[PDB]
């Protein structure tokens, strides 16, 4: 029940699946904006029928991806890089589940997201340099989880600033051909900080 992916294979699969999931997420946000405006007989119904139609698909994907993470990918992870990668993916997809879940489900997902993120963190801080793109993307998505889901701008800004400063510290001792990657995630973290503040 085990599968090992090269960095390229898992990167390409991640790009494909998150392209699909981002399409669905943006569609859901737009349908929600339409619902809110019309709410403020038959149209709204259909609108809801589309929103319920979106939410389902999204779920079916996210759930189906998390299964493959749990039943297959996460157990079969040797390198710490891949471990942090798969735990961040678990946290990200639980975050997407929480983004539209209602009731205690929104609670559920949220928990399973944090437990995932923390997990990756507990590896990253002891297995990956602060300059590593996996670790920086983990910190960025984790601070996003803090700000948008758990509604904690304080912890979010703390995590973002910590990651950015540790990166910018270890930056001087870093090859250019291995720092051009970290550049973009570091700048995204900086932009997110300037916005939140």
């Amino acid at each position: 029940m085990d599968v090992e992916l090269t960095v390229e294979e898992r990167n390409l699969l991640s790009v494909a699946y998150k392209n699909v999931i981002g399409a669905r997420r943006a569609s859901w946000r737009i349908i929600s904006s339409i619902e809110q405006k019309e709410e403020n007989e038959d149209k709204l119904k259909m609108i809801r029928e589309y929103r319920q139609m979106v939410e389902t698909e999204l779920k079916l994907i996210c759930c189906d991806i998390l299964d493959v993470l749990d039943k297959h990918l996460i157990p079969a992870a040797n390198t710490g890089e891949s471990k942090v990668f798969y735990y961040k993916m678990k946290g990200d997809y639980h975050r997407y589940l929480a983004e539209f879940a209602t009731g205690n489900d929104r609670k559920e997902a949220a928990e399973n997201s944090l437990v995932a993120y923390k997990a990756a963190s507990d590896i990253a801080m002891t297995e990956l340099p602060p300059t590593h793109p996996i670790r920086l993307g983990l910190a960025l998505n984790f601070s996003v989880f803090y700000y948008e889901i758990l509604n904690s701008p304080d912890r979010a800004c703390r995590l973002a600033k910590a990651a950015f400063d540790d990166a910018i510290a270890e930056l001087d001792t870093l090859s250019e051909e291995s720092y051009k990657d970290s550049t973009l995630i570091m700048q995204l973290l900086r932009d997110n900080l300037t916005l939140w503040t």
């Binding site: 790009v15 960025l140 997110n192 916005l195 939140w196």
Partner: peptide, 7 residues
């Protein structure tokens, strides 16, 4: 409303 990591 806030940027996550590119994928």
């Amino acid at each position: 409303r806030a940027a996550s990591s590119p994928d």
